[PDB]
Each structure stands twice: as structure tokens, then as C-alpha cells.
Symmetry: D2
Subunit: 123 residues, 4 copies
């Protein structure tokens, strides 16, 4: 069992507009997801989207946010096995620290061998 | 409002042993957490620990896992404002993809300006 | 701030069929919900639907369960401010124990004073 | 598989003081939990405790709330297999509506048979 846990905004999107319905896709990143799906990886979209607007209220995110996510994922033929909302929002200046984390430009640029290598170096 | 969201196993720990009580600290990473706390950043420990063992049951994780995490964090003087369990487990071969993610070796060796640069280069 | 936390199956529905899209509404209970909404109560639909099927995987409930919940709620004109999925599944013989809990027939048949009296007895 | 989903304050406790560490147990309710535990019922303590104080922030509840819940459950010899926090807070006048819900003094006074009877009247 192997999953990719994939952020939505800025990772699968170009984050060019506040209108989530019409945000531009990052095509190279999405195409890489497809190749990983072919390799047996499950794809989990995990996102903090609208955690700021609703002050962490998942009950509201489930109503106003989820529909537009799925609609957008479908329109751009992004493969996904799961969607998860309510991810902790780091804030404007915040960020995530993780030994198994890659940035979307590294994911698009590297094969599995050399992603494995990035991680082994940490260990 | 600014937060670091920090993984536990492999980021704050050297992952040298299955005994979580007695696992060795990554001292350079923790020391960097202290400097960021000084800058006004809130520290959130977020972990998938025991998601495999309990098959996703946070009801059990709350009982068996949380006490040992806090005890360990306290023992090693790790600053934290929040703990969050129930992070999605990626499996042995899985990983996270995120435009705001840094690995613990990058976090330990770069300043804020430098981290900011990694991210800005992602936007074009 | 005052909230009704409302179960879905067997409370807002008659639980007459496993086909959630076409399941019959409990009209009296829904209408009482309309009154409480007018009185300033936030309405939170909380449900364990498809927890059994997906074995607690909300990643999948978000994809396959949520759309049908909202479509149904919308067509039967149920007031709601929040939907919450991922509620613990009690199993067939299991149940819920809460000092502030009413069953749908009690809610349908009593007024606010009466319900408060039901709880004041508990104290 | 069969589960009791049990609320904490006012159900397992007498809710006589805001000092959770020294709050009185409802001995009859706890003793009934033990009998259900003997019959093969899993016991899930589920609670909104400290959701008001921390404004829904589970990251804080895990730190300041869980240890005290656990020490108290252990002290009063309460059987449990799971603790769930972060349950939605109904507010002062709010309440829960569920077709499988019993109040803690219905649980205390009835046996399994009549509790099932209590539910088949709703069905
Ligand atoms: Hg951020
Ligand atoms: Hg992994
Ligand atoms: Hg049940
Ligand atoms: Hg309440």
C-alpha cells in the first residue's frame, strides 16, 4: 500500500486567481500524477482550502468548498482516489516540515529512483 | 498568524528504534524550532504515528499514542503550541507533495530568507 | 449561540430503502427543524453514513457520500448551516448516550419548554 | 460489532463543578457501562469538552484536555476502548437529535430489551 498525499492550491493549480472554479492547472504536475497512478500509487488530495474563510469550520467547508474541488478535478482529468479537507492552515508566512515531503517542481522533474534518493539522504 | 506544521517521526526524531519512548532526538532540527518560536511562529506537531497499527482509529491513538508523544516532547524540550494526530499515512513508499514543504535537513541549514526563496522559485 | 446537532438516517429520513437518493423524508421532523431555524438555531447535520461501507475512510465518504446528502437535503428543502460526516458508527445493536439527546418522535411532538424540562429532569 | 457512544459530562459525571479533575461520578451509569462491556459492547467516550474554551481547536484539546479525561476515567474504573474529542458543541440551549439516542437515566434504569423496544417505537 502506497499513497501520494497531494496539496491542491499551488501544487495542482497555478494559483493565478481567487476564483477556484477557474484557476489554471499545473499540467506537468498533473501528468506526473497519472504516471504514478499507473505505478499503483493511490492519490489522496489533501487541502486547507477555505480553512481561513470559515475559521476551521469543516461543516461549512463540506458545503461550500468540496463541490468546487471535485468539479475542478474532474474537468482537468486529475486522477484521485480520496479527497480530504480540513488540513491545518499554515498562514501566509507559514510552512510544512516533513522528511517525506517534495515540492511540486521536484515531483515533476524527478523519477521515483531520485525521489527515493532525496529521502534516503535525510535518513 | 504564522505556523510551522511539523512532522514527528523522522523530522524531530532519528527514527532509530520502534520504542517511541526512547527514540533519539534530531537536535539541530529542534534547536531551529526554538529560533522560529522566538520569531513569533506557532509550532504544530502533526503526526501519522500509530495510524498503521490502529488502522486509522484515532479513538485508540488518543489513548495509547498521545501520552508518549507529549512525554517525549517535554523530555526533549521541544516547543509546541498544538499537537494533531490522525495525519494520513502514506505507506512505506508514499510521500507528500506540497509547494510549501521543506525537508528537515533544508529547515536546519537555511534561514527564513532562504526558505522564502525556495517557495518563490516554485511560483514561476 | 445555539445549535441543533441532527442525525440524518432514521431522523430526517424514514430509512425505508438503502437507496439514499430516493429515501422518504420524515416531514414532521423536517418542519420542526424549520421552526427552530426561525428561533435562531444553527442546524448541523451530523452523520455516520457510509462509515460502514468505506470502513471509516472519510476520504471516500467525501467523494461518494456527500454529494448525495446535499442533493437530497436541497430537494426536501431542509435548512442546514453545516454538514459533518465521519460520525462514529455504533453498529447494528449499538446506540448513543447523551444527557442532551432527543429521539426524532420526541422532537416532533414536544415544544422547547418541554424539551428543556426533559433535560432539567436529568440534572 | 456493537458500540456504545457515550458522552462524558452530565452522563458519566454529575457536572457539579467546572473542575473536571474532581467532578463527581454518576456511579449507576458507570456500573451499567460495565455490564454492557461484559456483553461484548465496545465503549467509546465521545466529548465536546473544552471545544468552547479553545474555539474548536483540537490541537489544544489534545494537550490540555485529554490527560485529565483519561486520569479521571481510570480513577473511577470506567471501561473504555476509545476516546474521541472534538465533538461538535451544541451551546447552552442546543441539543442532539438521534433515533438511537438515550439519556443517561434511561440507560441506567432500563435493560437491553426495553432499550431496543424504545428504538423500535421510532422505526
Ligand atoms: Hg502557507
Ligand atoms: Hg511514507
Ligand atoms: Hg446503530
Ligand atoms: Hg448543550
Amino acid at each position: 500500500m502506497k499513497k501520494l498525499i497531494v496539496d491542491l492550491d499551488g501544487t495542482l493549480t497555478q494559483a493565478n486567481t481567487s476564483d477556484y472554479r477557474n484557476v489554471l492547472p499545473r499540467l506537468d504536475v498533473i501528468e506526473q500524477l497519472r504516471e504514478y497512478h499507473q505505478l499503483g500509487f493511490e492519490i489522496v488530495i489533501s487541502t486547507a482550502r477555505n480553512m481561513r474563510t470559515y475559521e476551521g469550520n469543516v461543516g461549512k467547508i463540506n458545503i461550500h468548498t468540496l463541490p468546487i474541488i471535485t468539479e475542478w478535478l474532474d474537468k482537468h482529468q486529475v486522477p484521485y482516489d480520496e479527497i480530504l479537507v480540513g488540513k491545518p492552515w499554515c498562514g501566509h508566512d507559514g510552512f510544512y516540515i516533513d522528511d517525506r515531503a517534495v515540492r511540486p517542481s521536484e515531483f515533476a522533474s524527478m523519477n521515483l529512483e531520485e525521489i527515493h534518493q532525496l529521502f534516503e539522504k535525510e535518513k
